[PDB]
TrEMBL record, chains A, B:
Catalyzes the condensation of para-aminobenzoate (pABA) with 6-hydroxymethyl-7,8-dihydropterin diphosphate (DHPt-PP) to form 7,8-dihydropteroate (H2Pte), the immediate precursor of folate derivatives. It catalyses: (7,8-dihydropterin-6-yl)methyl diphosphate + 4-aminobenzoate = 7,8-dihydropteroate + diphosphate. It comes from Stenotrophomonas maltophilia (strain K279a). This is Dihydropteroate synthase. The keyword Amino-acid biosynthesis does not apply. It holds the Pfam family Pterin_bind. One of its GO terms (cellular component) is cytosol. Pathway: Cofactor biosynthesis; tetrahydrofolate biosynthesis; 7,8-dihydrofolate from 2-amino-4-hydroxy-6-hydroxymethyl-7,8-dihydropteridine diphosphate and 4-aminobenzoate: step 1/2. Belongs to the DHPS family.
Length: 265, 265
């Protein structure tokens, strides 16, 4: 069973780990720092800091996330991830204490590939159809599994060629990003097939629109039970990190699961 | 796909069904009926009416549950189950419109076997160590799976000898009833073993103390996420009815499960 060296903060991947979501959007720094610490006390094994909400300028993104990373790094021991697709924010976040990069664009932004390689921290390669801010309105796939797989194969290849070590790579199937409810459930059901790529898999389905379509819950905050069910299924099918808003609820569910899995067959 | 004929109210078991818990305890009648109606609109496929809390006298148990069954039967189309171990309560409830008997004692109360046979409604044979009103302080099992199996085999045969048709029998592993948290997790993990009995399996772990022990939650109403996880796992391992307090939450989880399972492997 592998583990991540998150710039010195080790995260074992023998069991599923919970990544809490800390969005810094309008002081706002103290509120976000408090929010992360409260997620840690609820059981979060790591925190994901993001400054996007009009897309956010690099200067504003840096002003939003750097103080929150600096402070959380000094006030918790869990790995602190930076949720950005921009190379300057990757370099600066890591310099302020981030030990992981979570990139919705899959290092496809100009300079992101080389910048993330040079930081030496683990990087999550997400799949999305489209570009940050412009997701496909009518997503389409001949074979959503094969295309998401093919994309990940080539980003992983680019990462290796750009100088990455394999221990520093994760994949994320990117539920919700340019995908219908059918695409999402199909990827989730066949998600175990992506384990053949040999890197840990991160899954994020927290309060996603597809969960609401299936259950009829139009309000995202009413989608807690479905998110717990979704992340449990993702974990059963090989996801070893789950990115969630509802940390305590996900933590509780994983405890039931771990106890069930410990029984010898 | 099998089904229960609950005194004329058909309950299909092609997918897991949600049984809502309606406890009638001290106008308490109008409150319980309203609560039953609310569980139905939240999605409950059937309701379980019980008058126990100190053991309750038969006169009081009937005074509590009969009006609630009569009225709920007249205002919903769902099966109404009576949660009792007592023969008189079984006969009166079924005559008042109950279409199922849910028995913690496994028809072991004096006269229960013959009384329930004569009603003609499906009956849940639960396993418990101990007696109604006196639960075991230190439950023990050499082999909890084999012993729960052996018990259920014998209750099914005794029911067979009393005249039951198989369509009128379900089993219930009785999580929490004369069981440590460890016993519960072993039974839950290996619960698929009991599908060989050839009858539908009902699972109830809603807000149970064992979930609090696994998660650290002292408040039972703080145990929803763990109840959702437990019941999803129970359904994945063969339970086709789940008995729950948090109906809307469990329904939302089961819809996610069904959507994932509909994808072709």
């Amino acid at each position: 069973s592998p583990q991540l060296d998150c710039a010195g903060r080790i995260l074992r991947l023998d069991r599923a780990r919970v990544m809490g979501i800390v969005n810094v959007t309008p002081d706002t720094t103290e509120a976000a720092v408090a929010h992360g610490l409260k997620l840690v006390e609820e059981g979060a094994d790591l925190l994901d800091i993001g400054g996007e909400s009009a897309p956010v300028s690099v200067e504003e993104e840096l002003r939003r996330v750097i103080p929150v990373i600096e402070q959380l790094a000094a006030r918790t021991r869990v790995p602190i991830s930076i949720d950005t697709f921009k190379p300057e924010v990757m370099r600066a976040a890591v310099a302020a204490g981030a030990g992981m990069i979570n990139d919705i664009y899959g290092l496809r932004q100009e300079g992101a590939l080389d910048a993330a390689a040079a930081t030496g921290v683990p990087v999550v390669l997400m799949h999305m159809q489209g570009e940050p801010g412009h997701m496909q309105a009518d997503p389409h796939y001949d074979d959503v599994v094969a295309e998401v797989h093919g994309f990940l194969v080539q980003r992983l290849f680019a990462a290796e060629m750009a100088g990455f070590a394999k221990k520093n790579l994760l994949i994320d199937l990117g539920f919700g990003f340019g995908k219908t409810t059918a695409h999402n459930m199909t990827l989730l059901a066949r998600s175990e097939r992506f384990l053949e790529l040999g890197v840990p898999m991160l899954a994020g389905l927290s309060r996603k629109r597809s969960l609401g379509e299936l259950t009829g819950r139009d309000t995202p905050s009413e989608r807690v039970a479905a998110s717990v069910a979704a992340h449990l299924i993702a974990v059963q099918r090989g996801a070893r990190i789950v990115r969630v808003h509802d940390v305590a609820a996900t933590v509780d569910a994983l405890k039931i699961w771990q106890a069930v899995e410990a029984v010898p067959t």
